[PDB]
A paper describes a structure:
The inner membrane export gate protein, SctV (InvA in SPI-1 and SsaV in SPI-2), is the largest component of the injectisome and is essential for assembly and function of T3SS. SctV comprises a highly conserved N-terminal transmembrane (TM) domain and a less conserved C-terminal cytoplasmic domain (SctVC), which are connected via a ∼20–40 amino acid linker, SctVL, in most bacteria using the T3SS. It has been reported that SctV is one of the “engines” of T3SS; the TM domain forms a putative proton channel, and SctVC forms a nonameric ring connecting to SctN (ATPase) through SctO (the stalk protein) to function as the F0F1-ATPase, coupling energy from ATP hydrolysis and the proton-motive force to secrete unfolded bacterial effectors into the eukaryotic host. Consistent with other reported SctVC structures, the SsaVC monomer also has a four-subdomain (SD) structure and further assembles to a nonameric ring aligned to SD3, which is the most conserved region of SsaVC.
In this study, through generating a chimeric protein consisting of the TM region of InvA and the cytoplasmic region of SsaV, we produced the full-length SctV in a high-order oligomeric state which was adequate for structural study using cryo-EM single particle analysis. A homogeneous and oligomerized ISS protein was eventually obtained in buffer containing the detergent Glyco-diosgenin (GDN); however, SsaV (similarly to InvA) could not form the stable nonamer in this condition. We reconstructed a high-resolution cryo-EM structure of SsaVC with an averaged resolution of 2.11 Å. Unlike SsaVC, for which we obtained high-resolution structural information, the EM density of InvATM is blurry, and the SsaVL EM density is absent, with an approximately constant distance between the cytoplasmic domain and TM domain; this is consistent with a recent study. Structural comparison between SsaVC and InvAC in a closed conformation or its counterpart in flagellum, FlhAC, in an open conformation shows that SsaVC in a full-length context presents a semi-open conformation. The diameter of the channel at the center of the SsaVC nonamer ranges from ∼54-41 Å from the cytosolic face to the TM face. Consistent with the observation above, B-factor analysis of the SsaVC structure also shows that SD3 is the most stable region of SsaVC with the more flexible SD2 and SD4 floating around it. In each SsaVC monomer, the hydrophobic pocket at the connection region between SD1 and SD3 is occupied by a hydrophobic peptide (M346-V347-P348-G349-A350) from the neighboring SsaVL, forming the hydrophobic interactions between two adjacent subunits. Using 3D classification with this map as the reference without a local mask, the linker region was classified into variable conformations, with two major orientations, featured as left and right linkers (bottom-left panel).
Residue numbers in the entry:
A (entry chain E), B (entry chain A), C (entry chain I): 346 to 681
């Protein structure tokens, strides 16, 4: 009886276990830390004797992932495309797609310019995927405390000033909000500086997160697209922007949105209908409506990034693909 | 004369005592801790010389369970079903049902896919049942203090921040309220984080418990149904919802419900009449009426879970079975 | 997993690496410190095995510079002019221009009175260029703390009085604002004295930065032109000055500018059109409009210096080249 659930459990059949799985998992953890700034806890491996090849991932002892690999599962390719086809299944909780390939098909797919995993790697490519879906569950008050203690080696004055400006709960909330939107918190020096700059003039954690996002726009654009090539952008029309802006209500803890269920459902439906034509799109809205749009779209569309006009500079061309726009619904259908 | 009643006493006849009873009881305690997050105290075994095979369970020296096993009691099956029939009695305080089976009938029931206990196990399966009915009696201020002290090994900052936000009596009240509704408090890290997040914006312990329940909805649904198969759902109609919502009165300590005895009795009667058609149903109501419905139904219907719409996500289909709805009674019978 | 991104990474192919690169880089860092007052962190050299000669510069692990040198790249000349022509490419993020020259052409260009780099020097001349574009990213609260601690050896009383007058966040903000406009902070004694003088009478960090700029006008003019020869000056007309002055709005944290997007775009367009006739021009405006003009022109025109009338004394002749002037746009086009 030890209070506190074990953070990370990976349960595997004895066949799936390998001698190099530990180092492979550690390398995946180091890659995730470098890519996101979130230091993950150690993965606890549990060998489960089972005739059927099954693997499960439990976060804090709650099963979040389960998958039975087929008997022919020897080469794995995350995602789907035209050049590769065969033995494709969709992972639960809308993580993405996985394809199982034979040796020659895996070789030709690797030659095509894709990553193919064999052996223990196939486990990591799965675990990493799951770990990428629940990153925000690994950054809280204690983890923020750990990051701040680590930052005191070279930035003792910065950490002291940040603590002078904000309590640890607000810092943890800001870091968690950043992590939940796939924004890396690797650059703690810049994030802490931005929080110090804006804390006296702003008490709302959501607005502080928006300011930090603006300060990190270089990294956000670098991660969204490695190259300067024009990636498609879907603009939110002025009708939706004003509809969501008029719903902003301010209380002592900051501003929230007060929109009807019909409105949110119709914007979500039209956005989803406007997302099926291409694999990836970036939704761009105004500065004062980006966070509210995200929080009314994060429940269903979690993997789509919501960008703000201030988050893209004037040195990047926009290549607008579509322009989604609607007016109110309850008062009058209007555009909807 | 030692002040403080002994928490857990199991009194057995010498025949029922076994050499492996201690380890069996300890395993049951470890299972209960893993399933509920509540660390139970040590069970004190008292051998009572009696010609009649009897066992009693006393919580804090008050007899809460008593049962005389028959002479043919050698295989025990908790619950009732169609495939198994014979020597069935109903446990007191509406715990459930117990069936005593012969060797061949126990073998066929085990083959049918049920759990059958023989020997000392039959005691534990009974004790565990009793322990599952009075879990909320083992989580108080001292037990909350113990859990927080245990959590300080890896989450010292989290515990310090929680103490900064809330006094120990409110934390204990929240934990007890969670335990009383069969919500596991195993994930203390998430519960403490939610309490830290919502404590500045909310002083009502019931509302804080509701927020923690919302944060734990993944585990709640996982426990209510292990699989994704559609389990039946009984919706509370809008008439009952508005009737109970109009009765909300707010004082300095928070909001309570002020409903007539006739109203509560009629809702309880109709809910019970709507529960007899199937073995298990999940009552689903609005967010602002879930706690009040629970506290007006917990006295009689303790084993039925009251869920809120926010507690089920949009990724689960609802399969509505019935729609209970009534208007007021005293002003006019209306639907009732 | 070490929290805190590595500040300075230079990634080179093994061919570009040299035995004297370390000392060359250190000399460049000492020159930059002497010229700007900003102590740079150590450059971390990473040798990347690649068939193509490529070099990248990453600030806090974010790639900010990338360039593939050609096979004939043996002599490098930063900038462009009439006497030198051949193999010229433009660096990204509008840093400037680079020209690759052959041995005899490099010799004749050096004789013409220009600096030509061969070997490891060609790397530094590139890195320095990049380091000159992002100097403001190396001066924050921790770096300000370091400079103040260094200043306590000979100016303990001055540092104590400055701390008595201002908190470290405001001092860091002032230093960063000075560095971002290519104003050296080498003379910390004078900057701290000015901040002590003006802190009781002024709480706005932007106004304090303006006062420090006024106190440092001797160095600013010395850096802008080494000689007393007449360098061209572009005056901002009274219409633009009054248009931007009427937009000044004051809140509890100081004064900001509230101008329409059309206004800012038209002033930027006319300034850019008025900058193409000559290689270098100095924009001169009023004292109360210099900072606002800079902050509405820094995003696009970062390398052009915005001067104030108080920043030039009466001992220097002005040699006005152009007089840009416009009225409002939205109310009426007027001059625009």
């Amino acid at each position: 009886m030890v209070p506190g659930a074990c953070p990370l459990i990976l349960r595997l059949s004895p066949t799936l276990h390998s001698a190099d799985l530990i180092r492979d998992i550690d390398a995946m953890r180091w890659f995730l830390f470098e890519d996101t700034g979130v230091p993950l806890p150690e993965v606890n491996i549990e060998v489960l004797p089972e005739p059927t090849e099954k693997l499960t991932v439990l976060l804090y002892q709650e099963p979040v992932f389960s998958l039975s690999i087929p008997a022919q599962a020897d080469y794995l390719l995350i995602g789907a495309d035209a050049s590769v086809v065969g033995d494709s299944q969709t992972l639960p909780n809308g993580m993405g797609q996985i394809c199982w390939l034979t040796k020659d098909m895996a070789h030709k797919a690797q030659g095509f310019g894709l990553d193919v995993f064999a052996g223990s790697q196939r486990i990591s490519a799965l675990l990493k995927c799951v770990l990428l879906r629940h990153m925000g569950e690994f950054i809280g008050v204690q983890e923020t405390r750990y990051l701040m203690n680590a930052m005191e080696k070279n930035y003792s004055e910065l950490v002291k000033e940040l603590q002078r400006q904000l309590p640890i709960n607000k810092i943890a909330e800001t870091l968690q909000r950043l992590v939940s939107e796939r924004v890396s918190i690797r650059d703690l020096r810049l994030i802490f500086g931005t929080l110090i700059d804006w804390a006296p003039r702003e008490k709302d954690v959501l607005m502080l997160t928006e300011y930090v996002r603006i300060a990190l726009r270089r990294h956000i654009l670098r991660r969204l697209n490695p190259e300067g090539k024009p990636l498609p952008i879907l603009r939110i029309g002025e009708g939706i922007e004003n509809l969501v802006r008029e719903s902003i209500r301010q209380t002592a803890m900051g501003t929230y949105t007060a929109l009807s269920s019909r409105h949110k459902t119709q914007i979500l439906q039209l956005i989803e209908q406007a997302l099926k034509q291409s694999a990836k799109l970036f939704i761009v809205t105004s500065v004062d409506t980006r966070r509210f749009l995200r929080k009314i779209t994060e429940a269903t569309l979690f993997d789509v990034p919501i960008l703000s006009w201030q988050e893209l500079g004037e040195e990047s061309l926009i290549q607008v693909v579509e322009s989604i726009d609607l007016s109110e619904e309850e008062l009058a259908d209007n555009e909807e």
